[PDB]
Amino acid sequence: LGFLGAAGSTMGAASMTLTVDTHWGIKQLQARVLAVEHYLRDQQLLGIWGCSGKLICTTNVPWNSTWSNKTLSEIWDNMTWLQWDKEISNYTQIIYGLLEESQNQQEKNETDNLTCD
Amino acid sequence: AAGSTMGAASMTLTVQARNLLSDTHWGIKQLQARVLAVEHYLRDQQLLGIWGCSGKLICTTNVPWNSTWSNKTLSEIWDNMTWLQWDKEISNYTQIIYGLLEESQNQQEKNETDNLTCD
Amino acid sequence: GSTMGAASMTLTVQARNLLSGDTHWGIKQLQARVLAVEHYLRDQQLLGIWGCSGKLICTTNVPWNSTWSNKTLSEIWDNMTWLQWDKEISNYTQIIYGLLEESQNQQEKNETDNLTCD
Amino acid sequence: XXXXXXXXXXXXXXXXXXXXCXXXXXXXXXXXXXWXXXXXXXXXXXXXXXXXXXXXXXXXXXXXXXXXXXXXXXXXXXXXXXXXXXXXXXXXXXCXXXXXXXXXXXXXXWXXXXXXXXXX
Amino acid sequence: XXXXXXXXXXXXXXXXXXXXXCXXXXXXXXXXXXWXXXXXXXXXXXXXXXXXXXXXXXXXXXXXXXXXXXXXXXXXXXXXXXXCXXXXXXXXXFXXXXXXXX
Amino acid sequence: ENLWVTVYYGVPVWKDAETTLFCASHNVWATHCCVPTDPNPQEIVLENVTENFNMWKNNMVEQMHEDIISLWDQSLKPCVKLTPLCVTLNCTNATASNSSIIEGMKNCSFNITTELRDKREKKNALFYKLDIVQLDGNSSQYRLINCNTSAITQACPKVSFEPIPIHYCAPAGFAILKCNNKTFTGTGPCNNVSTVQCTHGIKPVVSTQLLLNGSLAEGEIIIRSENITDNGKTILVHLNESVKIECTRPNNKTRTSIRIGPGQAFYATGQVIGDIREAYCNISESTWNETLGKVVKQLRKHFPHKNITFQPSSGGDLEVTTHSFNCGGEFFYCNTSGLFNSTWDSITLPCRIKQIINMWQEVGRAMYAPPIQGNITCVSNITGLILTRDNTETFRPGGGDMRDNWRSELYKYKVVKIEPLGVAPTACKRRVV
Amino acid sequence: ENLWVTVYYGVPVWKDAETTLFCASHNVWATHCCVPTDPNPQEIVLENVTENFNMWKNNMVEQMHEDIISLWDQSLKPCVKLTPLCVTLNCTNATASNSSIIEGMKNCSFNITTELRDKREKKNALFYKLDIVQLDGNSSQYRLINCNTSAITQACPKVSFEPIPIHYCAPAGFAILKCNNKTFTGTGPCNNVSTVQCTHGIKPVVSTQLLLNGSLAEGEIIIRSENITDNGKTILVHLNESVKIECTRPNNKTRTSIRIGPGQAFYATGQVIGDIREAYCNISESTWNETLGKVVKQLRKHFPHKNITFQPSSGGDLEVTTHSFNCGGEFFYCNTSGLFNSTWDSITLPCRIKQIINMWQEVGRAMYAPPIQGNITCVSNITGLILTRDNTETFRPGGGDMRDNWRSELYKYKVVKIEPLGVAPTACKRRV
Amino acid sequence: ENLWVTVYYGVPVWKDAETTLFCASHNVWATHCCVPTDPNPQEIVLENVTENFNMWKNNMVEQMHEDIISLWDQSLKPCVKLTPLCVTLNCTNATASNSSIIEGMKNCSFNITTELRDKREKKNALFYKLDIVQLDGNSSQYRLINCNTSAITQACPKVSFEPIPIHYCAPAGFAILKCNNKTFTGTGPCNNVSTVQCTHGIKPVVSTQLLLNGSLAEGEIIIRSENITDNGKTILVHLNESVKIECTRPNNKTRTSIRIGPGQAFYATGQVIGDIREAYCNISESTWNETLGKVVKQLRKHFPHKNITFQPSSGGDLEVTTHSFNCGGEFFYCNTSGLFNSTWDSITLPCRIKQIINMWQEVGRAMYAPPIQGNITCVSNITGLILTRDNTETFRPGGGDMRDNWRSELYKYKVVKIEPLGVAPTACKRRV
Ligand SMILES: *[C@@H]1O[C@H](CO)[C@@H](O[C@@H]2O[C@H](CO)[C@@H](O[C@@H]3O[C@H](CO)[C@@H](O)[C@H](O)[C@H]3NC(C)=O)[C@H](O)[C@H]2NC(C)=O)[C@H](O)[C@H]1NC(C)=O
Ligand SMILES: *[C@@H]1O[C@H](CO)[C@@H](O[C@@H]2O[C@H](CO)[C@@H](O[C@@H]3O[C@H](CO)[C@@H](O)[C@H](O)[C@H]3NC(C)=O)[C@H](O)[C@H]2NC(C)=O)[C@H](O)[C@H]1NC(C)=O
Ligand SMILES: *[C@@H]1O[C@H](CO)[C@@H](O)[C@H](O)[C@H]1NC(C)=O
Ligand SMILES: *[C@@H]1O[C@H](CO)[C@@H](O)[C@H](O)[C@H]1NC(C)=O
Ligand SMILES: *[C@@H]1O[C@H](CO)[C@@H](O)[C@H](O)[C@H]1NC(C)=O
Ligand SMILES: *[C@@H]1O[C@H](CO)[C@@H](O)[C@H](O)[C@H]1NC(C)=O
Ligand SMILES: *[C@@H]1O[C@H](CO)[C@@H](O)[C@H](O)[C@H]1NC(C)=O
Ligand SMILES: *[C@@H]1O[C@H](CO)[C@@H](O)[C@H](O)[C@H]1NC(C)=O
């Protein structure tokens, strides 16, 4: 499979493909700048969550049954990633906020004056 | 967060980071604003990289603190002072500390480079 | 280059200098600034895919091929300059980079297949 | 949407031979791949399968030792090397799309097929 | 079972024919039985998605071990082998034979 | 507990999005779309996906439209203005050997400023009737048709406006999805979708009533409309076979040159030597009848009544009443009433020629097409028709705003943003040492 | 103590800065400031933060100033030039509603080029005296006042300049601090500060003496100056109650036109039907006196000896001696001497009208305001006054170079740059 | 096993590159090159580094040329066009002092449109005959020569083009290598190379046959050519000692003012009084002869048969037959034949003045140089010569296409791109 080749696959199967002229001058600069901003925005966010460099991040935030009450045997085998994104389109920013809080709490705990590393 | 105290405000470091990223006359003014925001972001990230901190919010290092910079106990500055006040108390010095952080990391990189400890 | 092919102990100066230390004029200046950023990022992206994020030097799992030099370590280190070396192996740069990418992909396939949990 | 078996490699009984197949107009990866063959005057039956979406494989007991199966997904191609041809091995081997990228395999489509001699 | 295929159920006089007969433990085991057909000297085409699905030329059905494919009367175009097969623990069950005429 | 959050990056998810595509491929487009294309582009089949397309709401059409307009103006901007060429013109009947022959042209003379601002010279040139108007009464005093609304810029006779294939390419972070369903009608779900980075090469051909030099339909003739039963919508007919239209101007045009300023030369027609036919097009009659009959057969699937007829266009100017095209650099306005007059070896369409061209509906600008020396011939492929519709069902060779001309090629493409980051639950908690 | 440096990123601190701000919103303002606002703007209170604000050094004013001037030039640029009108005009007394009794207008005839370059036509228009300068003594020959310095541009009656609130927004990496002290005087620390991304929306209203349609003070009347003692300073009086003012021209004007080129046309004034008093403005009685009552009461806190005198502007160009404003596209110049004339149901001021406008502070970039057909009435709120000062004290309805009108609302806002890095000691050293 | 790939970042290597350099420091040069330079740039000397330089292919020269043409043109945009002056001129012999004795000057009358578009006036102007072409046979009527090809823009009265030192600076990621070999000939390996951020300050001086106000050679006189053997190439002679050249126009010029539009005027020459010589230059005789003899001694190293002669420029227009330069606001053209005439106390070089300048040989553009009032003297330093060679070798003066005038300063600089990544074999394999 190539780019987006796994789009019609189940979420589980798809986990294996994660590794895959003045006005003109203004338009070209806008395109270049946005490409950079999109790149940096994803990196900043993975950085904040404390897992930059990884395609799969294991975190310490519990999954809320509110976000989804489906089990793993349904989510990973009976859904695609597009469907999943729709299911949890709501609460995505909550999950992201919790991940940010968790990482910051972890880094703070690690520098504690009594029990550092 | 700016109204709190150091060490309490340390619990808000992420919200202060995520807000740093995003007619030819107007088009240039806006492109300049976007480019400048990117330059500043990258400058801070590169500098953290150089000091040996990299993609972390909080990093300890190998540079000691002394009275020259500020003769305070941890109990006085943490939780009894605002980051803004701290920035004023240790205004100046910043460029010295930054220089020391780089030198310390250069030595750390050199120690690993010289030891040649590998598979 | 500025000296022998010996590793230099000062690498951070070269790196920090990359980030910056009449309508058409304004466009040309933006193009220059944007390109400096793009060049900076392309080197960082390339290092990242080799598992070198955050490092100024990396030991890797790709063996050196004799067809890339036909020389031993003593014939290169402290014998040649960095410019001479760069010229000698200019036909293998893409090959080496491709192999480094593949090695890292195998390392990342591992770990993924063997994640450590609590 | 299209496939073709490579011409079969004719061989003497108990001799080695190898099959190959080309895929077209498909991802040739999401779907599983399969082989089946019809003996003279007989219906076809499965000989082997390859989990083309993966590196896994399976084989009919009849050819468990005699034939291989693999999916060269990178090349939009598949193969089935074989050895020790049964004298009664002159069957027309067809390529098939087993589908089931997510679930529920069936032979969705067949290639024209080719038979190797099993005598010479 | 080799689908317990009838040797020549699909073999019939012009304009009418019997459903092709099939029976297997594999068909009983899962609803994964399906029909395929081939002209003489030709690769098969799916005839049905399942014994009970996409039976567009003629109807088809299953009853645990039993299965059948209705004939499209006995159109000359219907004169193709009517093989039955079903998913198994590994590979699939296949009809030994399925003669046809129209 | 169980079910912990895990983050995945590189996830095959996308959302509808609008971005700026870049253009890649003496020619105006060759100069502008300087960016090369991928010599070996890939197409990725997305197995088991369905996507929703809508060609009538496809912003790629709008974006290409705006880029074409900007290029057109950029190209003409650094050229000679004909602003000083606007004086009363003293006009008489144009002639050809032995008589008062050129029924479509006038012999116009005028007093125009020369090298010095205190002197004028009397100059004369041939002009087309379609581009000139009378000032009053029944006098011989005339004005150029647009020198009351906007300035006319002379196109630089060195610039080529010949359409070349153009590929539109997505920027990083974006991809273009393409619909590969042979019977897709322009809207709704498509069950055979692939991903590409660049579109196929589309020639930015300008035309009105007939669509020229496009792609042919993979399947049978497809009738496409936003709402086919709505008389307010345009119907595009996409043919699966071309017609082949040959068209010419059987005359040798001879140029003169008038200096109208300090380095500004106005090109004008001096004399015309040739047959007394201004222009005409050759369409095979049998081909046309077969083609039209096939179109009707398909229209009858939406309008299953034996009451279909084709009539000539309703009144308007020669943007909507004629078949307009650029052939050899010349501007033709052809009468198609002989093609669209029916009820359900060749036919000649008489054609007229203009030099002052108000291309597009914005009257704020106008172009003067300099005369082209010698004679012009070309062959084009009719790949589709534009029809409008309104007891019986009357179709006419009506037309749109030239977005339709591009929609007919861009209909199978959609732009989406890639969103590689996302989350899901897993039975694994981060291990912190 | 055995302390070590710890590096922090995302530290909530800032430094003062000047940056490029962007706007959020046929109208020129809407066309340029095309960016939508936040439907639900946020505001964060920064408890225990003290910040020094200084409106007289606030560069947000300078950015607003430059963007407004730039927008006007861009808006007017793609329009009709009036260069062809710099011809001798034959000007005689214009007919009023009855006979030739209308003052301020002249009926001017002239020879102007038609769309065709080889023809001239005799055309005429009425003009205001304020836009016309005599060519010689004892003569009917006149020229437009601009032809002495520059060609001018007609404003196209396609584009509206009607002010709408403009929200100025900081870019990523920046924030706008806002002062929430109801009695803030413009130069001291604010002990109640909040952070916003965009300002509240300031209407770019232009005037010379009385500030119209602004926000009223939350508290009592505030007298703001950089230095109250210094006479060479603008004094801004920010009222806590508005004074209603109504302005009108009860005369139906005829808008007609002269073609000057290929799609180029000049809008001329034809016969006008109605009164001959021209324009005037109504300021309520025992409203103005009360308002001034309150203002003086506050001035007395700086000038305790009283003896406060209000005089008319001392002199200078019409643009600085009168109250100028844009009324529906028409430019009014109102006297005001009836207001600023006192030592310690309505009053009306006569107003004059001009069509050739020297905008901002520069002659040579002048605009021609086309006539507006029919009659006009404007209603507006007086929200502040601009005073200048000279054994008594004299105040004048003086004014500044536009900056002072904008530095009337942009006093509560400051732009700061976020500085995410810093260090502090902790008890833990880094370890391998 | 041994021999593993190691990745390095910050490796001190570079590649030749073509990039955009930036310029750093009422004057156009100063206005545009607003960016300040480092007062203390360093020269980082590269021990044992050899670099191949090539003056003749140096992209920095092209960049300097483009910046100059672009700036020059941009500076003339917001000023009066003299198009209205392209009318028939009625010319006679100009007078000064003792009547019609001024060779080269004409007294021309013409009908010019005045401030009002409906009026014409007869005006006089004093012109150089070099800028005027006779019309309609051998008659009294004349034309300004630019009107035949293009409109002429008047040089802006308030804009100075006086050369100031200009430094070219590398963008981040780039560096400039400088050749420090005192005898370097412009091409080939330089064995003493330092790296800098900016070039030295080079003035954008414009001249033809003689190069003025450059830096002198560190070593002995250097003859630089792309190919010394090839007669089709320019030979630059870089002197190690300067020659003083004093150029003067001992005449008191006065100007008039003819308004040609709403805020525009021509600034025609009015009258001339003084020593009617129309300019000349003073060059010391012994200095020149010794200087030239030293140049010949060096030419003899390429031309060992010792048979060398110098002849005057062979032909073409004044831009190639004379020495041209801009002295204050006037454009001088000097004969130079008094210098380049020999085989192997002062010399006065007659000069002429022009006002219509085909600057940079654009053709489609021209600039009008307003007269400068009063009397003028300029003293310049001759730092190099431009020669073209064609038994006896004949050398004639003659300039290039302007690029040659900047090669003489930029010859020692090269731009390279920094490339921090690379690999090398090591003994180590990566740990798990
Ligand atoms: C879904 O869309 C796909 C495109 O993304 C279609 O795939 C195309 O099918 C064509 C056959 O139907 C292929 O043509 C053949 O290509 C091979 C080489 O790949 C040549 O040797 C063959 O000669 C040629 N066939 C002919 C008649 O010449 C296309 O190459 C192939 N395109 C891609 C990208 O693979 C699917 O067919 C389409 N499916 C459905 C159901 O519509
Ligand atoms: C420091 O500045 C703060 C603003 O940045 C002031 O906080 C504001 O106080 C207002 C009351 O005086 C609040 O208004 C009320 O808001 C609620 C919803 O939050 C509405 O239901 C009420 O109807 C409304 N009250 C009225 C009379 O309309 C503002 O919402 C509140 N603003 C914010 C951002 O919280 C502080 O009061 C000020 N401190 C001092 C000492 O003045
Ligand atoms: C301000 O100080 C009070 C104590 O005086 C404290 O309770 C409050 O939390 C502080 N505000 C912030 C933002 O920390
Ligand atoms: C131009 O004038 C000439 C005069 O001989 C005449 O023969 C020619 O027909 C005229 N042409 C036009 C276009 O008026
Ligand atoms: C030229 O002037 C008007 C401008 O709108 C144009 O519509 C018209 O056709 C021309 N004049 C006439 C009335 O012929
Ligand atoms: C101006 O003069 C013209 C002359 O024809 C006359 O018709 C017009 O009514 C006059 N207008 C006024 C206001 O006097
Ligand atoms: C040009 O001729 C006029 C004639 O009136 C005379 O006054 C003027 O002085 C002359 N100027 C020159 C420079 O000869
Ligand atoms: C020439 O001009 C200068 C300008 O300073 C003036 O001082 C001098 O007197 C003038 N000479 C004559 C002869 O007028």
d(CA H298, CA H293): 9
Query: Nearest 5 degrees, angle CA G301-CA G306-CA G310?
Result: 105
C-alpha count within 13 angstroms, C-beta hemisphere, residue F77: 10
Question: Would you call B100 helix, strand, or coil by DSSP?
Answer: helix
Q: Do C59 and B28 touch (CB under 8 A)?
A: no
G240: enclosing H helix or E strand: strand G235-253
CA–CA distance, H336 with H347 (Å, rounded to integer): 10
State whether residue D102 sits within 8 Å of chain F by CB: yes
User: For residue H427, which of H5, H103, H35, H7 has the smallest C-alpha distance?
Assistant: H5
Tokens 């000047």 locate to: G18
Three-class DSSP labels, chain H: CCCEEEEEECCCCEEECCCCCEEECCEHHHHHCCECCCCCCCCEECCCCCEEEEHHHCHHHHHHHHHHHHHHHHHCCCCCECHHHCCCEEEEECCCCCCCCCCCEEEEEEEEECCCCCCEEEEEEEEEHHHEEECCCCCCEEEEHHHHCCCCEECCCCCECCCCCEEEECCCCEEEEEECCCCCCCEEEECCEEEECECCCECCCCCCCEEECCCCCCCCCEEEECCCCCCCCEEEEEEEEEEEEEEEEEEEEEECCCEEECCEECCCEEEEEECCCCCEEEEEHHHHHHHHHHHHHHHCCCCCCCCEEECCCCCCCHHHHCEEEEECCEEEEECCCCCCCEECCEEEEEEEEECEECHHHCCCCCEECCCCCEEEEEEEEEEEEEEEECCCEEEEECCCCCCHHHHHHHCCEEEEEECCEEEEEECCCCCC
Preferred mutation among C56, C58, C73, C103 to probe B, highest tally of B CBs within 10 A: C56
Q: How far is CA G183 from CA E30, F153, G190, G223, G406, in A?
A: 82, 62, 10, 10, 19
C86: which residues sit within 8 A by CB, 6+ positions away? C1, H11, H13, H419, H422
CB F136 within 8 A of CB F301: no
* D103 CA: distance to closest CA in chain E (Å): 11
How many of the other CB atoms lie within 10 Å of CB of D16? 12
For ligand 1, atom 33, name the residue with the nearest CA.
D25
From the options 2.170.40.20, 3.30.365.10, 3.40.50.2300, 3.90.330.10, give the CATH code of F207-401. 2.170.40.20
Q: Residue A72 carries which side chain, given as an amino acid letter?
A: L
A117 contact residues in G (CB cutoff 8 A): 428, 431
**Sheet strands side by side (includes F413-418):** F14-16, F413-418, F174-179, F193-196, F44-46
C59 Cα distance to chain centroid? 12
CB E29 within 8 A of CB E88: yes
Cβ neighbours of residue F297 under 8 Å, at least 6 residues apart?
A: none
Do E42 and E29 touch, CB atoms closer than 8 A?
Answer: no
**Alpha-carbon distance H324 to H320, whole Å?**
9
**After which residue numbers is chain H interrupted with C–N beyond 2.5 angstroms?**
25, 344, 390
Interface of H with C (CB under 8 A): 1-14, 19-20, 22, 32, 44, 46-47, 49, 74, 171-173, 418-431
Would the CA dihedral through C62, C67, C68, C74 be positive or negative? positive
Pair type for strands G153-154 and G105-113:
unpaired
| Cβ-based contacts of D101 with chain F (< 8 Å) | 47-48
Q: Which residue has the tokens 């010794």?
A: H290
The one-letter code for the residue type at F56 is: W
- Are residues H19 and H171 in contact, defined by beta-carbon separation less than 8 angstroms? yes
Distance, in Å, from the CA atom of D113 to the CA atom of E43, rounded to the nearest integer, reads 7
CB F105 within 8 A of CB F127: yes
Q: At what angle do helices A22-48 and C23-48 cross, to 10 degrees?
A: 30
User: How far apart (Å, rounded) are the C-alpha atoms in residues F13 and C34?
Assistant: 29
Ligand 5: distance of its center to the CA of F135 in Å? 10
Q: Which of residues 16-35 of C touch A (CB under 8 A)?
A: 23-24, 27, 30-31, 34
**Residue G225: partners with Cβ closer than 8 Å, 6 or more residues away:** G233, G234, G235, G236
Q: Which residues contact H420 (CB under 8 A, 6 or more apart)?
A: C14, C15, C18, C43, H9, H10, H11
Separation between Cα atoms, residue F217 and residue G6, nearest integer Å: 68
Query: Residues H397, H401, H406, CA angle at the centre, nearest 5°?
Result: 90
H290 near H284, Cβ under 8 Å? no
Q: Is G292 helix (H, G, I), strand (E, B) or coil?
A: helix
The verdict on a CB contact (< 8 Å) between B118 and H431 is yes
User: Cβ contacts of residue G252 below 8 Å, gap of 6+?
Assistant: G272, G273, G274, G373, G374, G375
The length of chain D in residues reads 120
Task: State the sign of the Cα–Cα–Cα–Cα dihedral G353, G357, G360, G362.
Answer: negative
Distance from the B21 Cα atom to the nearest Cα atom in chain A, whole angstroms: 7
Domain ranges of chain C: 9-57, 60-118
Place of tokens 């699966």: F240
Cα G319 from chain centroid?
12
Question: Which residues, listed in sequence order, are joined to residue H255 by a DSSP beta bridge?
Answer: H269
Q: How many whole angstroms separate alpha carbon F260 and alpha carbon F252?
A: 25
- CA–centroid distance for F221 within its chain: 21
Buried b (16+ CB within 10 A) or exposed e, G221-230: bbbbbbebee
By residue count, chain G amounts to 432
Query: In the structure encoding, which two tokens stand for residue G85, read together?
Result: 């009108």
CA A47 to chain centre: 11
Q: Which atom of ligand 3 is nearest to the CA of G46?
A: 13
Q: 């003025």: which residue's tokens?
A: H212
DSSP state, residue G281: E
CB H279 within 8 A of CB H249: yes
Distance CA G223, CA G236 (A): 6
Cα–Cα distance between D79 and H32 in angstroms, integer?
A: 70
Q: Which of D7, F172, H400 is nearest to A39 (CA)?
A: F172
* F366-368/F152-154 β-pairing: parallel
Q: Determine the Cα–Cα distance for residues G416 and B2; give it in Å rounded to an integer.
A: 13
Task: Name the residue among H309, H311, H358, H310 with its Cα closest to residue H333.
Answer: H358
Give chain B's largest Cα–Cα span: 60
Contact between C2 and B92 under an 8 Å Cβ cutoff? The reply is no
Question: How far apart are the C-alpha atoms of F386 and F400, rounded to whole Å?
Answer: 8
* CA dist list (Å): G232 to F419, G226, G343, G402, H426: 60, 10, 22, 16, 76
What dihedral angle (degrees, nearest 10) is formed by the CA atoms of F42, F45, F46, F52?
90
Q: Count CB-CB contacts under 10 A for residue H337.
A: 15
Strand locations in F262-381, DSSP E?
264-274, 280-284, 308-310, 323-327, 330-334, 342-343, 346-354, 356-357, 366-368, 374-380
B39–C26: do the CB atoms touch at under 8 Å?
Answer: no
Distance from the Cα of residue F128 to its chain's centroid: 23
C-beta of residue F347 within 8 angstroms of C-beta of residue F337: no
Q: Which amino acid is at G169?
A: C
C-alpha F192/C-alpha F48 separation (Å) is: 8
- Distance CA(F268)–CA(F54), nearest Å, equals 47
Alpha-carbon distance of A37 to B34, in angstroms, equals: 9
- Chains touching D by CB (3 or more pairs below 8 Å): A, E, F
What gap in Å lies between CA F296 and CA E102, rounded to an integer? 39
Contacts of G336-341 with CB under 8 Å at 24 or more apart are G336/G209, G336/G210, G336/G312, G336/G397, G337/G312, G339/G283, G339/G288, G339/G310, G339/G397, G340/G310, G340/G311, G340/G312, G340/G313, G340/G395, G340/G396, G340/G397, G341/G310, G341/G311, G341/G312
Residue H22: which of H174, H145, H133 has the closest Cα? H174
Instruction: Decide if D16 contacts D74 (C-beta within 8 A).
Output: no
Nearest to H63 by CA among H199, H226, H216: H199
Ligand 4 neighbours, Cβ below 6 Å, are F 107, 109, 124-126
CA–CA distance, F387 with G62 (Å, rounded to integer): 57
> CB of G6 within 8 A of CB of G426?
yes
Contact C116 F429 (CB under 8 A): no
Residues 6+ positions from G289 with CB-CB distance below 8 Å:
none
Q: Is the dihedral of CA G341, G345, G349, G354 positive or negative?
A: positive
Distance CA E83, CA G403 (A): 91
Domain boundaries, chain F: 87-146, 207-401
CB F59 within 8 A of CB F403: no
Cα F134 to Cα F89: distance, rounded to the nearest angstrom: 9
CA distance D10 to G123: 103
Tell me which chain C residues have a C-beta less than 8 angstroms from the C-beta of A55. Answer: 108, 112
Question: Which amino acid is present at H226?
Answer: E
List CB contacts of E49: < 8 A, sequence separation 6 or more.
D106, E34
Identify from E35, E91, E95, E97 which residue to disrupt to test chain D contact, counting D C-beta atoms within 10 A and taking the largest count.
E91
Q: Residue count of chain E, please give it.
A: 102
Quote the Cα angle for G68-G73-G76, to 5°.
120
Q: What SS3 state is found at D113?
A: coil
Distance between CA atoms of residues H132 and H143, nearest Å: 6
What values do phi and psi take at A86, rounded to 5? -65, -45
Which of D:17-46 have CB within 8 Å of A?
27, 29-30
Q: Which long-range contacts (CB under 8 A, 24 or more apart) does G295-299 make?
A: G295/G221, G295/G223, G295/G237, G295/G239, G295/G385, G296/G344, G298/G220, G298/G221, G298/G222, G298/G223, G298/G237, G299/G223, G299/G395
Measure the CA–CA gap between H170 and F91, rounded to whole angstroms.
64
Q: How far apart are CA F268 and CA F107, in angstroms?
A: 12
What is d(CA C88, CA C73) in angstroms, rounded to the nearest whole number?
14
- G47 C-alpha to center of ligand 3: Å? 6
